[PDB]
Amino acid sequence: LSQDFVEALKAVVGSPHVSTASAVREQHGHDESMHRCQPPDAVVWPQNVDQVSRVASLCYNQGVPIIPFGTGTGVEGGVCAVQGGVCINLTHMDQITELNTEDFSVVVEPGVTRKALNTHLRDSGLWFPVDPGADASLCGMAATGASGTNAVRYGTMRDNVINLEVVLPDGRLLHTAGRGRHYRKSAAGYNLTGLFVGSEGTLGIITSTTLRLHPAPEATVAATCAFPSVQAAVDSTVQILQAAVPVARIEFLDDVMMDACNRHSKLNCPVAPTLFLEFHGSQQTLAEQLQRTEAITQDNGGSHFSAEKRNELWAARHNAWYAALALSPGSKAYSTDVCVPISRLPEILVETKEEIKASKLTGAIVGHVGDGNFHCILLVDPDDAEEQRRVKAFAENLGRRALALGGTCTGEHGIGLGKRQLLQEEVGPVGVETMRQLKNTLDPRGLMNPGKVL
């Protein structure tokens, strides 16, 4: 990157907020994925939307790639600077604006995490429900299309994003539903907001997100239930869903994952395939829901069901990724993320469990089985290229299996670098060309996070 160009960057954001130091670039060259660190040529920290626009326009017109960077917790290599360029760390824009408790909405900048938002909402009766395990940027969650354990009841980011402020690749400012607008539904024109949710930084830079807030539940009960087999746990899950019990959370852990979480959290659950469950409602709803759910799990061989213990339960779940890595310190990991029609979920989870067992790989299974969806967390020796090939082969084959079942190769993590071939198979030639046309119209020079998604 030329010195005159670095100077121009410093004129916009100030010298403390531009760095070409190799250690800074290396920290921003990777995420939580196993994709090899690819350092940007520079990291830039804009202080407001005008500066984001000016940095984008400078990079775009000079032919310099732009990589938006939130909290760097992605798991598909989205922030890897595969073509070099300028990494734009957005987290100094960290303000909550426009809290509208009477409309159940809020506007947040990229430096606001879900925990920061809910802390600011303590005492209001409202909360934001979409809960990835990491304390991620909410605008980053909008960019990846994130979901979480609460999504089965409260929806994904796509369900809860009302409006987006986006700096387009050439610096133009777009408010996807109109500046300052927020409403529960619209038929006005084409839905631009939904195009940018799940775009992973390839269509523009999200500089604020308008989010739907939800009422705190009247009462909450959490429970665990252990099963003799994966099949029993997942059959129970499908029957709970088909009975339309409005569970707030329904998470599956296999025996390997349960053991890992036990050792990482001072939970001490029976080592067995397990459901973590949560119910929201009044005492009457809760009593009724608990009895219908216990009846269903009992029929499939579930054990008997088992506020600070609730926090430890979900803290252990949210840290399952780190619990899995701790089984073999020094390993990295790859995660699958398929989502299938729920009637096919028993087939593919039992099959995945059998394939993990039959192979020499170490893997644990956890996920949002309420949301078509589960993760296979596969461990990899960072210095064993053969094991890396086999893990990648395993992930690819699981992906194709989900696609054969009418599902999708990713329920929530996104495509980044890892799933680009699976995406092509998932939507076919016309779908690929259509997505390419959308990318080309918004990013003609192809400088917006190149090499990702498509």
Ligand SMILES: Cc1cc2nc3c(=O)[nH]c(=O)nc-3n(C[C@H](O)[C@H](O)[C@H](O)COP(=O)(O)OP(=O)(O)OC[C@H]3O[C@@H](n4cnc5c(N)ncnc54)[C@H](O)[C@@H]3O)c2cc1C
């Ligand atoms: C322990 C753990 C648990 C997790 N659990 C979940 C889970 O349950 N569900 C889930 O969906 N994910 C989960 N994640 C993954 C990750 O937290 C989410 O994908 C999250 O949305 C990433 O946000 P980020 O800001 O950290 O992303 P980054 O890694 O910084 O960026 C991810 C991608 O989005 C782009 N991007 C980031 N910010 C912006 C922006 N403002 N505008 C435009 N593009 C942008 C980047 O260029 C990149 O392509 C988990 C991760 C960890 C480590």
Ligand SMILES: [Mn+2]
């Ligand atoms: Mn998840």
